[PDB]
Design a protein around this motif. Structure first.
Motif, mmCIF file in Angstrom:
data_model
loop_
_atom_site.group_PDB
_atom_site.id
_atom_site.type_symbol
_atom_site.label_atom_id
_atom_site.label_comp_id
_atom_site.label_asym_id
_atom_site.label_seq_id
_atom_site.Cartn_x
_atom_site.Cartn_y
_atom_site.Cartn_z
ATOM 1 N N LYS C 42 0.800 -1.213 0.000
ATOM 2 C CA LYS C 42 0.000 0.000 0.000
ATOM 3 C C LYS C 42 0.837 1.269 0.000
ATOM 4 C CE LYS C 42 -3.918 -1.952 2.610
ATOM 5 N NZ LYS C 42 -4.734 -1.792 3.843
ATOM 6 N N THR C 43 2.156 1.166 0.157
ATOM 7 C CA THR C 43 3.009 2.345 0.174
ATOM 8 C C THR C 43 3.069 2.985 -1.212
ATOM 9 O OG1 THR C 43 5.177 3.188 0.873
ATOM 10 C CG2 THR C 43 5.145 1.067 -0.288
ATOM 11 N N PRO C 46 6.109 3.205 -6.077
ATOM 12 C CA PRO C 46 5.677 2.065 -6.914
ATOM 13 C C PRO C 46 6.744 1.009 -7.051
ATOM 14 C CG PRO C 46 5.418 4.215 -8.028
ATOM 15 C CD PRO C 46 6.354 4.408 -6.886
ATOM 16 N N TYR C 47 7.974 1.391 -6.715
ATOM 17 C CA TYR C 47 9.104 0.508 -6.502
ATOM 18 C C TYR C 47 8.808 -0.553 -5.462
ATOM 19 C CZ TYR C 47 13.851 -0.668 -6.339
ATOM 20 O OH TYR C 47 15.009 -1.321 -6.508
ATOM 21 N N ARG C 49 6.064 -1.271 -3.803
ATOM 22 C CA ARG C 49 4.796 -1.974 -3.953
ATOM 23 C C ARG C 49 4.957 -3.218 -4.816
ATOM 24 N NH1 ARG C 49 2.093 1.898 -5.622
ATOM 25 N NH2 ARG C 49 1.612 1.661 -7.852
ATOM 26 N N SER C 50 5.754 -3.129 -5.876
ATOM 27 C CA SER C 50 5.914 -4.251 -6.788
ATOM 28 C C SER C 50 6.999 -5.231 -6.387
ATOM 29 C CB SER C 50 6.200 -3.730 -8.177
ATOM 30 O OG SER C 50 4.968 -3.286 -8.675
ATOM 31 N N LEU C 51 7.894 -4.843 -5.495
ATOM 32 C CA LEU C 51 8.839 -5.806 -4.962
ATOM 33 C C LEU C 51 8.179 -6.707 -3.929
ATOM 34 C CD1 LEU C 51 11.712 -6.841 -4.748
ATOM 35 C CD2 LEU C 51 12.189 -4.946 -3.222
#
Lengths: 59, 158, 61, 129, 116
Positions: C42-43, C46-47, C49-51
């Protein structure tokens, strides 16, 4: 019919751009209308390179 | 309709600066070159065999576009038969090259310095024109500034 | 390549995401930790979130 | 514009940061009753004025009311069945997300109107008044 | 010949049909084979021989695994073949038993510790 061949010609421009052809719009229009009549296009591919070469010998 | 477009083709190869007889002489050389060669396998497969040659030397999305468009062009083939032989007669970052910061894609890739090294060539290709200009303005003017007198620029030859 | 300063700017953000869970989820044990890996999908970065949308896929087996 | 992908096509917010234009409250509690607010424009879903991306202002009240209508059907039913699954991450120099807000805003009132006139019908209540 | 017409020779050999019948398959074949023309992994023929040995042990023919050593000798005896790795890896990929764990055992190095 003229609405169809115009759209197909507009699609034919982009693929002659990424295939790196010697064509611009005018020789594209003449050679597509020539291919529409129907002759062997393998000889037209030689006559075009000869027409541009024989004009370039004058310059 | 072919007979008007061959006239337009002969209008373009005439340099427009008289000039009403030169067009007909260009028409002479035009027909004289047209009948020289005339004296002496599907359509789309010819596109497929070159899309393979495209894919071997990099550039995936160009072959991906080339194969989908001729699929909807077969759902006219003589034009593509003309194009497969004229494909060698042609001319002689944004925010997505190696963007691993933004996006909903997983950042998970290893290093090889052969995605970044052809990102150093993406800049050097701009710079290799912009460096040849610095060489080719002084040589181009030192070959004209120095000559023999009276034949140094042809405007004194008038 | 400028003394390898490009190579400390695709990671040093990998490491930055994974050094936050190394303190924030340090102090948890069991399923209460999988109440707080859901805090990094939820942070806004976008880095991160996808890791973590990939690591939580392995963790939820 | 991924919080709007749920809030405007449903009645839920999965944003935990409050910098979104809508902020969530619940008026189905024990200290809050049905006639202790009278309007769920008052205290349930309100609109933050200065946390707006500066052009969503044109649809702002409708943005609040769209996910606001849909939630009070969900809360005492299940009926959403949204016909707009179109989604966006804010493409500037295209007004597609004025159109998506308008389509969702019409659908929200369709669902709430159908729920309100079928279950706990406003026909019979006003007749009995 | 040139590789692009050789793909067409393949699509006429395996199918009993000509290229005029079906052209969806040849397009999909162009999608597969292109950008895979260079071995980006190690090409040790030794590992590929020791994988045929594991394959023939998995089919319970030790006599075939021991004649395979004489046939692997004959390649060394002539030595005129250039990539011994590719053709045996190709014949191994199309393996068939005339009558589980295989990724867990030996495979060629990825080159993620080297520049590709």
């Amino acid at each position: 019919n003229l609405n169809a061949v115009r759209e197909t010609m507009d699609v034919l421009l982009e693929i002659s751009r990424i295939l790196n052809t010697g064509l611009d719009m005018e020789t594209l229009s003449i050679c597509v209308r020539l291919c529409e009549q129907g002759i062997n296009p393998e000889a037209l591919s030689s006559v075009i390179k000869e027409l541009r070469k024989a004009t370039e010998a004058l310059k | 309709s072919i007979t008007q477009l061959f006239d337009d083709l002969c209008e373009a190869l005439l340099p427009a600066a008289n000039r009403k007889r030169a067009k007909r002489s260009l028409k002479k050389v035009a027909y004289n070159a047209l009948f020289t060669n005339l004296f002496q396998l599907p359509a789309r497969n010819k596109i497929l065999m070159l899309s393979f040659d495209l894919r071997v030397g990099g550039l995936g999305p160009k072959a991906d576009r080339l194969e989908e468009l001729v699929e909807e062009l077969e759902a006219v083939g003589s034009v593509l038969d003309l194009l497969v032989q004229l494909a060698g007669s042609g001319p002689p970052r944004d925010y997505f090259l190696n963007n691993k910061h933004v996006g909903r894609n997983v950042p998970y890739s290893g290093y090889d310095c052969d995605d970044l090294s052809v990102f150093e060539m993406d800049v050097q290709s701009l710079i290799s024109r912009e460096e040849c200009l610095c060489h080719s303005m002084i040589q181009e003017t030192l070959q004209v500034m120095e000559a023999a007198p009276g034949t140094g620029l042809p405007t004194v030859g008038l | 390549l400028r003394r390898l300063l490009v190579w400390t700017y695709d990671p040093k953000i990998r490491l930055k995401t994974l050094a936050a869970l190394v303190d924030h989820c340090q102090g948890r044990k069991g399923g209460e930790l999988a109440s707080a890996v859901h805090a990094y999908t939820k942070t806004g970065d976008p880095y991160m979130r996808s890791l973590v949308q990939h690591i939580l896929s392995l963790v939820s087996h | 514009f991924e919080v709007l992908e749920k809030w405007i096509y449903r009645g839920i917010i999965h944003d935990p940061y409050s910098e979104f234009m809508v902020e969530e409250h619940e008026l189905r509690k024990e200290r809050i009753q049905e006639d202790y607010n009278d309007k769920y424009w008052d205290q349930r879903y309100t609109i933050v004025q200065q946390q707006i991306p500066s052009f969503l202002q044109k649809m702002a009240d409708k943005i609040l009311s769209t996910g606001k209508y849909l939630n009070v059907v969900r809360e005492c039913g299940h009926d959403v069945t949204c016909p707009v699954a179109k989604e966006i991450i804010y493409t500037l120099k295209e007004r597609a997300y004025v159109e998506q807000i308008e389509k969702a805003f019409n659908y929200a009132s369709k669902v709430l109107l159908d729920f309100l006139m079928e279950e706990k019908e406003l026909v019979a209540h006003l007749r009995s008044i | 010949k040139s590789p692009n017409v050789l793909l067409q020779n393949l699509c006429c050999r395996i199918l009993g049909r000509s290229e005029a019948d079906v052209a969806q398959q040849f397009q999909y074949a162009v999608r597969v084979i292109g950008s895979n023309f260079a071995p980006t992994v190690e090409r040790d023929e030794f590992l590929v021989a020791e994988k045929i040995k594991k394959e023939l042990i998995r089919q319970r023919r030790e006599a075939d695994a021991a004649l395979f050593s004489e046939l692997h000798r004959k390649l060394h005896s002539q030595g005129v073949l250039k990539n011994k790795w590719s053709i045996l890896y190709l014949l191994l990929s199309l393996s068939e038993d005339p009558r589980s764990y295989a990724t867990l055992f030996a495979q060629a190095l990825p080159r993620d510790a080297h520049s590709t």
